[PDB]
Amino acid sequence: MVSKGEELFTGVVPILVELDGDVNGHKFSVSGEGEGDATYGKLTLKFICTTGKLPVPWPTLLTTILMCFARYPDHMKQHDFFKSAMPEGYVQERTIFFKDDGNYKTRAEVKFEGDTLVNRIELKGIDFKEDGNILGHKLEYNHDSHNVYIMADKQKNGIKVNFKIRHNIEDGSVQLADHYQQNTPIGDGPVLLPDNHYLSYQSALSKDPNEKRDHMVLLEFVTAAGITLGMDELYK
């Protein structure tokens, strides 16, 4: 018996992910599994495209396929909406706009199913260019660090999250992916509505040398941080 959602995260927690996607009419499914440890801010995951070849590059789906595993420092624990919503979970919705290309729209439920944290997702991608960086597979197999900005959404009893991912293209250029995100509790009980803050993300993408299916091995590190007010030198 636990009083607060955060109590469910003192140790290692198994994770399952299941994603059904449809990008420019190309349908696919991805199944993932691994574990997360919020005391360390770590998630380790392996994803398989169970339907065959993935029609888009793995890094484009990375953000879509569990912010509840963030390490929030002691002095910020009152701002952890994600764990507070557990075990009932939250809905996580995004639109992702790839600059000069198509967009993904996603809806996910992240909740406990028995002892396991499960992220179930639907994704629809439309308006992609056949010879663009996404359908043309021109992205590098990496995903650089990014700080994602979170503000409370009082009326929805949830949060809004905006950030812009800079995907690396093989020719040295960047493909921008503007993310607009919202999270709302599934349950009706009180959740923590956070002051504005960041989650700092890192991602490391690899391959399993014994795996012949289309797949991605993913390690994430995520830690919460506060904000500093930037000042132009003029004002210092």
Side-chain angles (χ1 to χ4, degrees):
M1 204 192 66
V2 305
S3 290
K4 295 176 183 291
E6 68 170 1
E7 295 166 33
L8 298 175
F9 293 86
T10 52
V12 175
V13 176
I15 297 172
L16 290 168
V17 180
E18 182 66 23
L19 160 68
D20 291 325
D22 181 341
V23 179
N24 277 30
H26 304 298
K27 293 187 183 190
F28 58 97
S29 294
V30 167
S31 292
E33 186 161 21
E35 66 195 39
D37 187 336
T39 68
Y40 194 135
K42 177 176 88 169
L43 301 83
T44 46
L45 296 153
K46 177 176 171 184
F47 299 95
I48 301 292
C49 176
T50 59
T51 47
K53 292 307 295 307
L54 197 69
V56 296
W58 285 104
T60 70
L61 298 182
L62 192 152
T63 55
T64 297
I65 62 191
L66 297 100
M67 290 184 173
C68 50
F69 290 103
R71 185 205 157 242
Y72 274 76
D74 289 337
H75 75 279
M76 297 184 64
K77 282 185 193 305
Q78 70 270 41
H79 303 301
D80 189 349
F81 160 88
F82 306 101
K83 297 188 187 51
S84 76
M86 297 296 169
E88 303 99 319
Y90 51 80
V91 168
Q92 175 162 298
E93 284 169 296
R94 296 209 182 92
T95 300
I96 303 172
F97 296 90
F98 293 89
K99 190 170 174 198
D100 301 326
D101 212 327
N103 63 83
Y104 291 160
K105 190 165 189 164
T106 65
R107 182 177 190 280
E109 284 174 24
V110 181
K111 73 189 182 190
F112 275 86
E113 299 180 14
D115 65 356
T116 297
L117 222 347
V118 185
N119 184 15
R120 298 181 181 273
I121 316 162
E122 291 185 2
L123 176 152
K124 182 69 174 315
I126 66 175
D127 295 331
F128 285 90
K129 299 181 174 177
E130 294 300 332
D131 60 334
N133 294 321
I134 294 73
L135 294 180
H137 291 261
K138 303 187 189 176
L139 270 77
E140 303 177 3
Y141 192 70
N142 51 49
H143 200 271
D144 289 334
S145 62
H146 210 94
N147 304 119
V148 311
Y149 183 73
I150 297 169
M151 287 215 293
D153 187 332
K154 176 84 167 196
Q155 39 193 344
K156 293 186 181 172
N157 199 35
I159 57 177
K160 298 294 194 68
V161 183
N162 287 175
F163 53 103
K164 310 204 293 176
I165 298 299
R166 296 174 65 86
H167 293 290
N168 297 309
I169 303 307
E170 224 184 340
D171 71 346
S173 59
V174 171
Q175 169 64 70
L176 290 164
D178 282 27
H179 287 59
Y180 303 88
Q181 171 182 337
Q182 61 186 198
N183 295 60
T184 55
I186 293 177
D188 292 322
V191 294
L192 296 178
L193 296 177
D195 285 10
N196 313 326
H197 66 287
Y198 282 107
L199 294 185
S200 302
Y201 269 84
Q202 291 169 266
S203 313
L205 289 67
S206 61
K207 295 292 182 183
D208 173 349
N210 296 314
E211 179 58 70
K212 297 170 184 293
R213 295 168 295 180
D214 196 355
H215 73 284
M216 171 174 67
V217 178
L218 175 64
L219 168 74
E220 310 193 279
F221 289 113
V222 191
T223 301
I227 71 192
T228 295
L229 301 170
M231 290 175 63
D232 290 348
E233 276 298 329
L234 164 68
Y235 293 99
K236 294 180 183 172

